[PDB]
Design a protein around this ligand. Sequence first.
Ligand SMILES: Nc1ncnc2c1ncn2[C@@H]1O[C@H](COP(=O)(O)OP(=O)(O)CP(=O)(O)O)[C@@H](O)[C@H]1O
Length: 281
Amino acid sequence: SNSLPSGYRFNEFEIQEAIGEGGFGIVYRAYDHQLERTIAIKEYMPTSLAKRNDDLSIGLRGERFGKTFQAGLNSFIQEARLLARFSHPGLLHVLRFWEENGTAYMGTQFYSGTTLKNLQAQQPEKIDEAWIRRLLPPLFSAINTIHQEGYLHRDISLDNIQIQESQLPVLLDFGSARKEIGNLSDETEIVLKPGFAPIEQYTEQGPWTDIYALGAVLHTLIVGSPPPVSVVRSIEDSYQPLTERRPAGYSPELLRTVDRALALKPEDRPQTIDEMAELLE
Ligand SMILES: Nc1ncnc2c1ncn2[C@@H]1O[C@H](COP(=O)(O)OP(=O)(O)CP(=O)(O)O)[C@@H](O)[C@H]1O
């Protein structure tokens, strides 16, 4: 692990545990001793470009990586600024941002529960049609809130949706720094998510782009895996409609909503979150 130790201090903040460690950042449970509350701290840390020094700052693995490391850092800052535009229960709430240790940190609300990806892996039996229909209103609301301010998410999958102990969802991360590093480094495999990204993301985009990814999430919950990669579909569409599979315990109404969200061409999908929600009625 490259993570700061339990007990490390950022003035009033104390690290408690590294709870997430991926290729591009570390997430810590932390504590604010001034306000006496638990928070999360997200630390930019691209492992392919940087390493942990003895004094616990971050340093480049090679001088040639500096330009890309800085561009990822700038994208991390821009994503924090985007999330700071909102005060919505389904969007990661940003408390503070600062630079230190050669990198940057976001202090955020700490959420109960775990990711949808982990829930689907650990407790698939909890995920049925009734549970999905309770998930959708607050998830629709969070995504639509982004859209109404003129932005798109563009990185939806199961990995970045938190399911709280209340079952309410939170969008945690837009992948901005990861995707910028991938574009600049020609590491194409870290930019789009296969099976979740629709055809128009491979090179126009709008609310329908996030709608397709949401359909791909729902498809994964219902049958266990995402639909075929969208470029492959654009050559020979092997997607078989869920209305035709008939997985046990799922209504044609929910199944056709997923199928419509997964229409290959943007114009054939629901055009807004509101349009997709109407399909379930
Ligand atoms: N604000 C927040 N509050 C609580 N948990 C958060 C959070 N932001 C991110 N997380 C958690 O951080 C983790 C980030 O995922 P990541 O893939 O980087 O780490 P990981 O694989 O080491 C642990 P996991 O098995 O959950 O994925 C997820 O478990 C997510 O639930």
